[PDB]
Symmetry: D2
Subunit: 90 residues, 4 copies
């Protein structure tokens, strides 16, 4: 099996808010692999729900399985019950 561990800073570009069965949850869009900066290749991004105590500007580690699924002719990449962790930064 495959485990993917990403570190990224939560910001206005990579975050979104959805209304769920109970409350509002933030979702982050994180890269599934790396590329040459200024290169023409396409990086697949995965989604993961964030814990409620995380805010914009925080750096997080998102870690777990990723599953690719179809919605129409769009390909969704989703983390399946990942571990999400805040990184301490001063």
């Amino acid at each position: 099996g495959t485990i993917i561990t990403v570190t990224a800073q939560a910001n206005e570009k990579n975050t979104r808010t959805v209304s769920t069965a109970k409350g509002d949850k933030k979702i982050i869009s994180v890269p599934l692999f790396e590329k040459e900066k200024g290169s023409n290749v396409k990086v697949a991004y995965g989604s993961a729900f964030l814990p409620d105590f995380i805010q914009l500007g925080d750096t997080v580690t998102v870690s777990g399985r990723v599953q690719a699924k179809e919605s129409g002719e769009y390909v969704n990449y989703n983390f399946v019950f990942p571990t999400v962790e805040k990184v301490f930064i001063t």
Copy 2:
């Protein structure tokens, strides 16, 4: 940054031998995510140390970089054999 850890078996179907700077060396192809479905799975490549035999199960771990046509390559990964027996029942 992005670290990918994959455990897979080195079978003849996902392993090829290529000529390197110093001798014949094995390369393994490993999946980078899972599917439910008509999606295309991306596969990453990594060299295997000499002692690894076809049938061995290995863990490959490290950064995956997509290089320009695109290839997904592990950049100096950790590779370790997983010890597997047949069960007692």
Copy 3:
């Protein structure tokens, strides 16, 4: 933060079944780091719940964070809600 990914085979020495009010739970116990052959160090082992379908002989990857707890003189290392997936072996 810290993510620990361990791959091990389920066998008689590392896996057990505990009867609970919710039925049979399967607990695996895996090494958190390695040691030299003929070393005095006592390796920490972390525990995690296996899914119902897993049997002895199966090879699994356990992945996530580990917490150290005090219990008498015994120290417990637990995976906190880890990802558990089965590796396919032929």
Copy 4:
């Protein structure tokens, strides 16, 4: 096998300069797990060499095999040829 992946910011308290045969290099020390709020337990710290371009204040991801080794009564936890990368912030 076992892989540990840790993200930590490099500061004066977890980073030290040591002399090697290759010149002077920085080693970072990072916790290998967490502890419960009111528990009197010690956390193992893993060591890795930092690349020369990394600096105090940078956040870095270290990932790889961790090997414990003894010397007298002292116990070292060592990353074995880890992947070390910088995090953009």
